[PDB]
């Protein structure tokens, strides 16, 4: 009976592959061949946010595009003011091994997590003028890689236990557990409508999920190694993935297959962070070789290099209005480029 | 813009608190990664003091923080990249169990050659030396079964055996160390070094050994920094 199930899985995969090939009437590379190249784009460090005393492992931009939160291994969660380099808050973390952080769309909440298996929600808009742990979300059996806020009530997180969970902050319990990944889930990305989200894991596969029902809808493959980063295309019907094979892959939810390949023979180190800018024409990817190249998503080629970091570019996020992009790294500095 | 001056003053006081925390933290306080297997007595290393542990102890008024990550899965390649700024990796090895000693060697090799842990000097702790001695003295299990090179092995001339130690016990323990040192010196370069120590579940000198190797590690780092090494 197990052999029958394996045969059914194999024939389902073959049918999916055949459908993908049939839908592959043309190639996106040749379809975009008519697009004129933008040319070499130059982006310079506008702000350098110093004050962290250890590696910066994650950051998240605010919806206001003014305040950004950064997490560092020293045990601080600084809410900077990118415009004026002012540290609005500096939250002391109970566990210094923070691997992720999110800034709520409302702006009244910030989450963080890491090797403590706990997503700690912090209130930045308390009436007493301080920062306190709003809620200690517990229930994951692995390190938190990425957590994102749907709203001030719901937060979806990704763990190292191959599962993602949707939480209710007031309730403090897992509304829905997203099971199906085989390796550690390393990144999260929410669609602009917040009804679907993808999560690349350490199995060379990215899975598309539904937040409401709570089951995997589309499993994407095509990577050669552990996927470390993932983000949705601004249209919301596509996403990009960065992995250890020094290659970025763009997928389509509708087509359900790989579209393009963002790799070069000169880049050997893997990717740690991927983020579209505002229109899905620029794909900024952070590599371990201390700089984060800028790739033209449409032209599927490299059209810029963002050098200036003295260590691995762990985190890379773009403003929600497209006016800037911040690149935190292990050198204890966030550089905002424009 | 009075709000701007207020925000700037708050940023200045915040930065002052950050700097004060940095001094009080990175001064006579060192971070260590306590790593090992379930069988290895990693927990019972230093007798004198839900996702990650933290053991704090002092020797010469210098603080040490051991981080025992004991809640993640068995896939170690991603959460271990966080510990690339620690002073040392406290690798604990169970010398008695030769069956899992090969995978302990493989873990040591992966840590040594890891692209991020390639600058961290491992403080190797060959634990359960009493059990290893009892096993080799009984002779029910033979090391040359799990390693067909122990037969063509002799104890090093620089060995310092215990006075009440059997030559076979000394040969066995020094063979295991040299097996670890082989991986260490194959690709050790000059930025990180392995410090092996034969320790038991009763010896209370693990803290002093960690203190001395951390001193040696930091001294060699400083000598390299000032181009004296």
């Amino acid at each position: 009976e197990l052999d029958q199930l394996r045969q059914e899985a194999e024939q389902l995969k073959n049918q999916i592959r055949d459908a993908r090939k049939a839908c592959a009437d043309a190639t996106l590379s040749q379809i975009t061949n008519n697009i004129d190249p933008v040319g070499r784009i130059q982006m310079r460090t506008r702000r350098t946010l110093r004050g962290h005393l250890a590696k910066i492992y994650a950051m998240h931009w605010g919806t206001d595009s003014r305040l950004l939160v950064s997490a560092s291994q020293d045990g601080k969660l600084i809410i900077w003011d990118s415009y004026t380099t002012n540290k609005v808050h500096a939250i002391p973390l109970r566990s210094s091994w923070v691997m992720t952080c999110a800034y709520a769309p409302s702006g009244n909440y910030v989450a963080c997590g890491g090797l403590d298996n706990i997503c700690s929600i912090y209130n930045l808009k308390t009436r007493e003028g301080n920062v306190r742990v709003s809620r200690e979300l517990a229930g994951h059996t692995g390190y938190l890689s990425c957590c994102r806020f749907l709203d001030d009530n719901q937060i979806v997180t990704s763990s190292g236990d191959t599962t993602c969970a949707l939480w209710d902050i007031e309730t403090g319990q897992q509304t829905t557990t997203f099971t199906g990944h085989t390796g550690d889930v390393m990144s999260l990305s929410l669609a602009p409508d917040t009804r679907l989200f993808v999560s690349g894991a350490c199995d060379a596969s990215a899975k598309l999920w539904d937040v409401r029902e709570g089951m995997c809808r589309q499993t994407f493959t095509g990577h050669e190694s552990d996927i470390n980063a993932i983000c949705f295309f601004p249209n919301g019907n596509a996403f990009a993935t960065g992995s250890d094979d020094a290659t970025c892959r763009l997928f389509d939810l509708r087509a359900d297959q790989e579209l393009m390949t963002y790799s070069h023979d000169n880049i050997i180190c893997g990717i740690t962070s991927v983020s579209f800018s505002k229109s899905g024409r620029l794909l900024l990817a952070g590599y371990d070789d201390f700089n984060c190249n800028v790739w033209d998503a449409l032209k599927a080629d490299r059209a810029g290099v963002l050098a200036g970091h003295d260590n691995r570019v762990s985190c890379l996020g773009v403003t929600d209005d497209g006016m800037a992009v911040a690149t935190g790294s292990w050198d204890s500095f966030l550089k905002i480029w424009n | 813009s009075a709000e701007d001056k207020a925000a700037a003053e708050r940023s200045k006081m915040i930065d002052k608190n950050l700097r004060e925390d940095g001094e009080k933290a990175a001064a006579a306080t060192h971070r260590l990664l306590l790593l090992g297997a379930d069988n290895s007595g990693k927990s019972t290393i230093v007798k004198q003091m839900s996702g990650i542990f933290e053991t704090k102890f002092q020797v010469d008024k210098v603080n040490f923080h051991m981080f025992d990550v004991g809640a993640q899965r068995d896939e170690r390649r991603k959460w271990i990249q966080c510990f690339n700024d620690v002073t040392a990796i406290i690798f604990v090895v169970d010398s008695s169990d030769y069956n899992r000693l090969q995978e302990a060697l493989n873990d040591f090799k992966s840590i040594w050659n890891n692209r991020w842990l390639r600058t961290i000097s491992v403080i190797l702790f060959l634990n359960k030396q009493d059990l290893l001695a009892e096993k080799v003295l009984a002779g029910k299990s033979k090391i040359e079964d799990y390693f067909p090179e122990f037969a063509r092995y002799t104890t090093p001339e620089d060995a310092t055996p215990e006075p009440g130690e059997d030559p076979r016990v000394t040969r066995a323990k020094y063979f295991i160390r040299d097996e670890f040192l082989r991986i260490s010196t194959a690709s050790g370069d000059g930025r990180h070094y392995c410090y092996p120590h034969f320790t038991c579940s009763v010896d209370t000198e693990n803290a002093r050994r960690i203190f001395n190797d951390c001193r040696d590690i930091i001294q060699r780092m400083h000598l390299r920094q000032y181009e004296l090494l």
Partner: nanobody
Amino acid sequence: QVQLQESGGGLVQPGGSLRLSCAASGFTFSNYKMNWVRQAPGKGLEWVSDISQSGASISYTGSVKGRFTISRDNAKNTLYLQMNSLKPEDTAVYYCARCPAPFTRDCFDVTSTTYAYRGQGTQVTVS
């Protein structure tokens, strides 16, 4: 999709030989360190052999040195393990798990319980 399918194995008397064959498609086989992982029935997975990207850093576990030999064909994207002179202790399921990342000399996680890049495996029985 990364795929690792093994062909070989079966029932052989002690002292016999078996050339296991793992076909690895989907990824650049010439760019990854490749391992052989075996799980004895009732025991955890044990790393049993290893090769390099080219095939010059070959290393073996102690229990099989002088008995097993590993070889990689870059063009054929296939790797083998000639398990000659097999002993009754060699009864296990053999996996051809590759390494998590290319260009690296460390294979940090290949004997884990739920490693992503293992093959299905071939049960090798010796009696």
